[PDB]
Swiss-Prot record:
The chain holds residues 1025 to 1191 of 7096 of the full protein. It is found in: Host endoplasmic reticulum membrane. Responsible for the cleavages located at the N-terminus of the replicase polyprotein. Participates together with nsp4 in the assembly of virally-induced cytoplasmic double-membrane vesicles necessary for viral replication. Antagonizes innate immune induction of type I interferon by blocking the phosphorylation, dimerization and subsequent nuclear translocation of host IRF3. Also prevents host NF-kappa-B signaling. In addition, PL-PRO possesses a deubiquitinating/deISGylating activity and processes both 'Lys-48'- and 'Lys-63'-linked polyubiquitin chains from cellular substrates. It comes from the Viruses. Residues 1-167 form the Macro domain. It comes from Severe acute respiratory syndrome coronavirus 2. This is Papain-like protease nsp3. May form homohexamers. Interacts with N protein. It catalyses: Thiol-dependent hydrolysis of ester, thioester, amide, peptide and isopeptide bonds formed by the C-terminal Gly of ubiquitin (a 76-residue protein attached to proteins as an intracellular targeting signal).
């Protein structure tokens, strides 16, 4: 039993809810919140900008030190940093950005990072301003993640479409 509430169950391990992932992290304080990161951990907009803003820019400060030490992530890769006031940990995962021409096959590799954590609060990778089809992202998520994932979808219209079209 866990504290996530009001989710629709899609499969044995994947749950989804129309919710602002920022509001959901503050309320649950999950062990892991996933950020929709880029390779530079520059949290400007979309999900990333929102999570960083909620940390009063502490996420960005920590991220800049991480990059200065380690260099950029790989597309499809991840790193674990602090969850600040939102979660114990933040798993920064880089999905391909279609608006940069990145290979959509990297989306499966990106979701494989979730398998290193037993339970996660997460957004759909590569959706929103990353430019991929969210229906496809959900399919890849279900078919790749084996650990327990609770997906927050900000847009109600999109949430309904994801549920209604789910096979
Ligand atoms: O500002 C926020 N939250 C917040 C959450 C998500 C996002 C975001 O961009 N989502 C993305 C989005 C939007 C529309 C269609 C989409 O396919 C996606 C993918 C992604 C998502 O929905 O996962 C955001 O811009 C801000 N909270 C403050 C009031 C406290």
């Amino acid at each position: 039993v866990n504290s996530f509430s009001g989710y629709l169950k899609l499969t044995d391990n994947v749950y989804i809810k129309n919710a602002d992932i920022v509001e959901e992290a503050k309320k649950v304080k999950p062990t892991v919140v996933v950020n929709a990161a880029n390779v530079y951990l520059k949290h400007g907009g979309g999900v990333a900008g929102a999570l960083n803003k909620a940390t009063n820019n502490a996420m960005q400060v920590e991220s800049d030190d991480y990059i200065a030490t380690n260099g950029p992530l790989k597309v499809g890769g991840s790193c674990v940093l602090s969850g600040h006031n939102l979660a114990k940990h933040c798993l920064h995962v880089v999905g391909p950005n279609v608006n940069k021409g990145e290979d959509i096959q990297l989306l499966k590799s990106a979701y494989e990072n979730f398998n290193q954590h037993e339970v996660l609060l997460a957004p759909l990778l590569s959706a929103g301003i990353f430019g991929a089809d969210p229906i496809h992202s959900l399919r890849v998520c279900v078919d790749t993640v084996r650990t327990n994932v609770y997906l927050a979808v900000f847009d109600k219209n999109l949430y309904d479409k994801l549920v209604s079209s789910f096979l």
